[PDB]
Symmetry: C3
Subunit: 203 residues, 3 copies
């Protein structure tokens, strides 16, 4: 009676380890899917562009928006179009506008022009243009913040790029980092950066 309960417990302890082991593999697969989904939303949203702070208009149509876009380009980037779809999205502020361009080149060309100008205005009113990314990647850039700040202050010229890379000057050369772990390996090689981003990287 005491031995039967013992062997029963033993068998159970085995099932549990087996269940845990399987859970680990399962985990590793759910994580790969989450990353696959991230990469794909960024890939799809590649020719997209967010227009932020554009005055709403009583009864807007798809045609109205396209004209607005050209007004923006006219007012900001003269020297500089085909749209597959342009529309609002989907709190009391003007909704964003997604502009899916037919070509990715176009999306890039307008961001480059907007970054060189600094101030982008629509009828004097400063509007804002920015890439369209997946919530995941979007939250990845926001997590660079703390580190970005520290590098910013200490004149490292930090810079976040697609998808959510972090780049800055170290030895007269730009160093790109895909995640925090990659950066962790780099800081351990330079004493200066190591003690400067120690807490940030949570080492």
């Amino acid at each position: 009676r005491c031995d039967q309960l013992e062997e029963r417990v033993s068998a159970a302890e085995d099932e549990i380890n087996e269940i845990k082991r399987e859970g680990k593999f399962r985990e590793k697969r759910i994580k790969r899917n989450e990353q696959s989904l991230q990469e794909i939303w960024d890939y799809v949203k590649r020719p997209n562009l967010r227009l932020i702070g554009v005055p709403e208009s009583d009864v807007e149509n798809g045609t109205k928006l396209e004209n607005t876009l050209q007004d923006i380009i006219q007012e900001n980037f003269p020297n500089l179009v085909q749209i597959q779809e342009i529309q609002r999205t989907p709190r009391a502020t003007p909704r964003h506008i997604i502009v899916r361009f037919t070509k990715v080149e176009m999306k890039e060309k307008m961001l480059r022009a907007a970054r060189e100008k600094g101030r982008v205005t629509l009828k004097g009113k400063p509007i804002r243009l920015t890439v369209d990314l997946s919530a995941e990647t979007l939250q990845a850039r926001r997590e660079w913040g703390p580190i970005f700040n520290i590098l910013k202050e200490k004149n490292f010229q930090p810079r976040i790029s697609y998808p959510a890379k972090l780049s800055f000057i170290s030895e007269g050369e730009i160093k790109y980092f895909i995640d925090k772990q990659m950066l962790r390996d780099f800081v351990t090689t330079r004493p200066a950066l190591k003690e400067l981003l120690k807490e940030a990287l949570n080492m």
Copy 2:
């Protein structure tokens, strides 16, 4: 003694299990999220798409010319690409502007019977398998609201809406509706069986 050495292993095992249960409901929440994402990214990608069902049965020019005959025979347009996928397969037609896709779809609906050379065909919207199933599951509830004068309506992706207290209410899924009618006596006993509550 021995019974105590055992009573300890079992307490630990109870803990291990509990731990495992919690990781279960977590991985499951994430699974649903991934499922709901795919559902969204499929719908998105198929935004400028239309399906041609029943077309007699290969190059890109003939299919485009075929499309023209359809528009000319039923709807008195920029095509990015058009191609095939006991019945001739479907023909996916990807337009240049989602708007142009929406125009021809709405024209196909308001006309009713769309035909090619006299033979009946169809121009369905291109949606994810998940969103489609969702739309036909509102069916039962939609009928009930239609009967009891609520003016029901299904929209993209698969949202149900109707008049409740003089206000339009939108519901992205049944679950959201279940949480809604639960506090509405009239609706609750009216859609109880429909919502499997």
Copy 3:
């Protein structure tokens, strides 16, 4: 003592039930994951379908958008158009997204018939851009494909990873190995031929 064992009996017994339930629930999640993995495979194939992959193109520090496009034309002229985009990923692969999938197919068939693709003399490669899963599925047709080729079936692999050869004066398509297993069941001469490759 005696009452304690009596209280353990129930505890361990109940513990055994939880274990079983977990095994089942885990078994359902497993199914749901595969559906998601298979779905990710399919959605990637869809997106990457109008894409063409360039392998073995020397890098360049002054390389830009027009640089690549030019290089693509050089390849066309040396060995043999509307481009949605072209960009890099040992030289990085080049992903050429065409306007029409048809364009891609013309290119691929031309590279297959010519057999060898070179740039400025040095050899390169032109493969499809698909999901890892599909790329493997394609490679898994490998052995069987070669057997069909030796036996003059004139096999061919198409999107996604579909095998097609000529049998009974007609082209037969096979989406996977199991579909082929069902096909060869009623055809002894062919079964014998692929018995070991299909692992039957």
